[PDB]
Design an enzyme around this catalytic site. Structure first.
Site, PDB file in Angstrom:
ATOM      1  N   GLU A 149     -69.702 -77.224 -33.787  1.00 53.31           N
ATOM      2  CA  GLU A 149     -68.763 -78.324 -33.989  1.00 53.31           C
ATOM      3  C   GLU A 149     -67.741 -77.975 -35.063  1.00 53.31           C
ATOM      4  O   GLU A 149     -66.563 -78.332 -34.950  1.00 53.31           O
ATOM      5  CB  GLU A 149     -69.510 -79.600 -34.382  1.00 53.31           C
ATOM      6  CG  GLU A 149     -70.425 -80.166 -33.315  1.00 53.31           C
ATOM      7  CD  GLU A 149     -71.153 -81.415 -33.784  1.00 53.31           C
ATOM      8  OE1 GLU A 149     -70.606 -82.528 -33.617  1.00 53.31           O
ATOM      9  OE2 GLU A 149     -72.269 -81.286 -34.330  1.00 53.31           O
ATOM     10  N   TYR A 209     -50.905-100.206 -48.114  1.00 48.66           N
ATOM     11  CA  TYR A 209     -51.788 -99.691 -47.073  1.00 48.66           C
ATOM     12  C   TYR A 209     -51.343 -98.333 -46.541  1.00 48.66           C
ATOM     13  O   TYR A 209     -52.133 -97.671 -45.862  1.00 48.66           O
ATOM     14  CB  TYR A 209     -51.966-100.704 -45.935  1.00 48.66           C
ATOM     15  CG  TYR A 209     -50.694-101.248 -45.343  1.00 48.66           C
ATOM     16  CD1 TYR A 209     -49.752-100.400 -44.794  1.00 48.66           C
ATOM     17  CD2 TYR A 209     -50.442-102.615 -45.322  1.00 48.66           C
ATOM     18  CE1 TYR A 209     -48.589-100.884 -44.251  1.00 48.66           C
ATOM     19  CE2 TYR A 209     -49.277-103.113 -44.775  1.00 48.66           C
ATOM     20  CZ  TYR A 209     -48.353-102.236 -44.242  1.00 48.66           C
ATOM     21  OH  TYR A 209     -47.184-102.691 -43.683  1.00 48.66           O
ATOM     22  N   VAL A 224     -70.958 -87.679 -40.558  1.00 41.82           N
ATOM     23  CA  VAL A 224     -69.982 -88.757 -40.598  1.00 41.82           C
ATOM     24  C   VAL A 224     -70.358 -89.776 -41.662  1.00 41.82           C
ATOM     25  O   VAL A 224     -69.492 -90.512 -42.142  1.00 41.82           O
ATOM     26  CB  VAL A 224     -69.853 -89.453 -39.227  1.00 41.82           C
ATOM     27  CG1 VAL A 224     -69.074 -88.570 -38.250  1.00 41.82           C
ATOM     28  CG2 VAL A 224     -71.223 -89.810 -38.648  1.00 41.82           C
ATOM     29  N   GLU A 225     -71.640 -89.852 -42.027  1.00 40.08           N
ATOM     30  CA  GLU A 225     -72.036 -90.699 -43.147  1.00 40.08           C
ATOM     31  C   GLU A 225     -71.315 -90.281 -44.422  1.00 40.08           C
ATOM     32  O   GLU A 225     -70.954 -91.127 -45.249  1.00 40.08           O
ATOM     33  CB  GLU A 225     -73.549 -90.621 -43.347  1.00 40.08           C
ATOM     34  CG  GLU A 225     -74.367 -91.370 -42.306  1.00 40.08           C
ATOM     35  CD  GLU A 225     -74.770 -90.503 -41.128  1.00 40.08           C
ATOM     36  OE1 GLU A 225     -74.240 -89.392 -40.989  1.00 40.08           O
ATOM     37  OE2 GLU A 225     -75.617 -90.935 -40.325  1.00 40.08           O
ATOM     38  N   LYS A 241     -67.299 -91.363 -34.106  1.00 36.27           N
ATOM     39  CA  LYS A 241     -67.321 -90.045 -33.479  1.00 36.27           C
ATOM     40  C   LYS A 241     -67.281 -90.312 -31.981  1.00 36.27           C
ATOM     41  O   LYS A 241     -68.335 -90.446 -31.343  1.00 36.27           O
ATOM     42  CB  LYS A 241     -68.598 -89.296 -33.862  1.00 36.27           C
ATOM     43  CG  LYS A 241     -68.475 -87.789 -33.777  1.00 36.27           C
ATOM     44  CD  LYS A 241     -69.515 -87.118 -34.666  1.00 36.27           C
ATOM     45  CE  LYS A 241     -70.328 -86.101 -33.886  1.00 36.27           C
ATOM     46  NZ  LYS A 241     -71.256 -85.321 -34.734  1.00 36.27           N
TER      47      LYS A 241
END
Lengths: 120, 120, 120, 120, 120, 120, 120, 120
Positions: H21, H53, H72-73, H99
């Site tokens: 990946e 923003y 991804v955490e 994801k």
């Protein structure tokens, strides 16, 4: 040529080859295209120089919901046949009949049949 | 040939055959395609060798919102007619007028009329 | 001519040029169109005068999931080849193979290959 | 003929006629179609008998993001021009450049330009 | 608690304050949520311990299509009331009645009302 | 409590901190939720006991299209304030102002602000 | 607490009360949410301190496709139970089982059940 | 409290536990929500009293595209931490890292993690 569309009519019918489909029934969707010269209607703003699509809807409603066939192909043929019989103004029409939830173990959006019919 | 699109213009108009539609009004959507050779515009990066689509939008806005007809067919004809009158550069145009919420008891995405027009 | 569609079949395969794609695998989608005269099927409501699309699905399932190629182009060719071999009734078919999540740093919906094949 | 697609590439560019668009910038989307015989690639599973679409993406990325034009028409022409120069295998290509958020007071999905180009 | 949903039921009804809406009609959508203990049903796989959602659909179809009110608020109140009246096991329910195509000149997706009801 | 929604109102406005946004303008979307007891209205089918959501739309259309602020926060505050000011029966409201197409170089669906307001 | 999601898992199963559903089968969808402290995993970038969501998918694929129940309620109960049984670190989970294509004559998007489970 | 959202930011990153990946990469999406009092900003129309923003987007773009983690955490934890570190006025934030295209053989829309963080 100029065309009239009826996009994504949803019906609930009982067509299918398996007897278990005839008992349970499933969704059926129809896309309709009719060909016809519509300049005279837009020129005059007069509905008799065009075709009422509200009737065009009721035609497909009867073939899909008031009847039960084995093949969706028979739905497309009878829809197109009944269009050409009752509206001489329509020169050609293309009928697409969508079976979105068939008994096909797998992953897909839909299976569909699509025909084009005109007078001899 | 090279083409300019304006996808899914949404207007609120009062067209329709029933007088109850003329009082209430409803959404109308228009898809526009004009044909014209755009190589000279891309070759030169000069807007006078192309067509301002901001005007193309205002043309459809007036026909759908500043007027009230019986048939959506008349919307497509007047939109296409006014395109060909004011832009000699455009050779051909295809107009699609969508009625997404007609008074047709049933289930569907929309009914629509679609014409193609060019100069004689 | 009359046509049968199978819209947006989703498979998980291991095709790709990079060896890292062969190990990880990714989604592959296929749109299928076959051409064939379907009047006799709709006239008679008899499935032997048409083609079972449930088999058409299993054909694409095997080529995409039971095999591993480098190019998605080889997926489209083998799918179309196996269609024309086993269904003499089908005159022509168009196969679209979609790679929605390729290793292409960027932003897009998908890359796809699309071929049309008939018998000599 | 066989075709390769790249669907809905999203870029952020600074093209536009108004100087206020050149300062602010906006989204630009591109749909790409190239024509080329891909049987030899699917027959052989060899990428040199096809075209790497990852490069096809980088071509559009440079024209839309590494440059600033007045007209989106110039984006389509330069994208198509650079396709035909560098890939002799490609016979014809159709480029669609979408401006989804133009300064056009109104309601619509997008405005777009679409051209088809081949070698003389 | 545990919940049953019936997502996006689409009906055609004649509700509305204005008399022109009652003559013409328009689409109406309903989102249903009911709350109840489903642990017995999931453990025993026995519908006796749950609620037939085919009936929950018919209850909603009854209020929207077999009746005509001025307010969509009355649809929600009568759907809810009919639920707590007929299903002892249901502790609470949330009903949302969507009017996707109201006669409001403007640009929007839909207007809707939502209520939550339990027994005193 | 019970709720009324006006989902995805689309406007074209000229809000923005940068002067180029005020000259060019861009789309603005608003999601509206108001809270109030709707039981009287549903039981009596009498708008006298509810709030005309056609007016709620006009209140929102007023702030977004008849006014120009620097911040979308000011849209939300003025929409809310105008609601609690004019509708005694409304106890609380949640306003969400969406800027789908801000001048942020990047890839996203939208940015937005959301506020909830009640009376002290 | 912190959460892991597995959004819109699509399976083909043979669940259903009616015998015709068990023979034919239909699509089944599952939304998964689990609750657990993810701070260690995000701080240390170490899967040892989180839950492999590839296994969470296989747990769901197991109940829906390796088993056949009468009720979708039983899918949700067995998915949940299997989760709290195998993952000590998971404190609570919400399972939603969608039946997009039930044999309910009508017009809707889907019906579904949703449960939330924790340990006593 | 009041909230700012940055909906569906799309990035291309190289996060992942498996080495394949990190070499190939894949899409990553982030939904951002921050909580803060926006009443001063809406009343005064003064960005001084709110949060840019456009910076919140750059903070997210920084963690996803300028960094490579296994989990991804870790994206969610570092996005959040960077927010509470740099914006005193922000009281709480919820980060969701999607994801959409993980290497899980199966059929689904996406997997994701979601965290909520405040100061002790």
């Amino acid at each position: 040529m100029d065309k009239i569309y009826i996009h994504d009519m949803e019906f609930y019918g009982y067509h299918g080859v398996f007897p278990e489909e005839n008992k349970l029934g499933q969704r059926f969707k129809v896309d309709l295209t009719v060909e016809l010269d519509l300049k005279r209607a837009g020129e005059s703003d007069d509905l008799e120089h065009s075709v009422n699509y509200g009737e065009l809807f009721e035609l497909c409603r009867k073939v899909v919901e008031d009847r039960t066939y084995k093949l969706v192909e028979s739905i497309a043929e009878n829809i197109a046949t009944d269009i050409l019989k009752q509206y001489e103004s329509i020169s050609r029409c293309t009928i697409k009949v969508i079976k979105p939830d068939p008994p096909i173990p797998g992953h897909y959006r839909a299976v569909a049949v699509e025909i084009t019919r005109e007078r001899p």
